[PDB]
Amino acid sequence: MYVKLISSDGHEFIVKREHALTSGTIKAMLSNEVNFREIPSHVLSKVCMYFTYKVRYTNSSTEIPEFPIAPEIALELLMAANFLDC
C-alpha cells in the first residue's frame, strides 16, 4: 500500500504507507494524500530517501552506512525533520 506526499512545488512522491508512518506527524495527517506547503521537492525527496534508509537498516546486523546530506539542503532538511518528528 502506498501514499502520496506532495511538495510545495507540486512534486508528487509515492512511497509505501509503512515507510511514511515513520513520521508521527504524517500518521496524524493521514488519520491518503498529504500536501506540504513548507517543504520543497529537493527536501521532500531526501525525506523519502531517509524512510527507505531507516526501514532497511533498523535492527540490522549488516554494517550501516552514513546517511548523506549535502551542505546546501541541511537547514531546510533540519526544519522538515523537526516538523515531521523523524
Taking residue 11's Cβ as centre, other Cβ atoms within 10 Å add up to 14
Q: Is 35 in the site for other proteins (CB under 8 A)?
A: no
Place of cell 531546510: 76
Smallest distance, Å, CB 31 to other proteins?
Answer: 22
Taking residue 82's Cβ as centre, other Cβ atoms within 10 Å add up to 10
Q: Is 82 in the site for other proteins (CB under 8 A)?
A: yes
**CA–CA gap between residue 37 and residue 6 (Å, rounded):** 9
Q: Is 21 in the site for other proteins (CB under 8 A)?
A: no
Q: Which residues bind other proteins (CB under 8 A)?
A: 2, 7-16, 19, 40-42, 45, 47-58, 61, 63-79, 81-82, 84-86
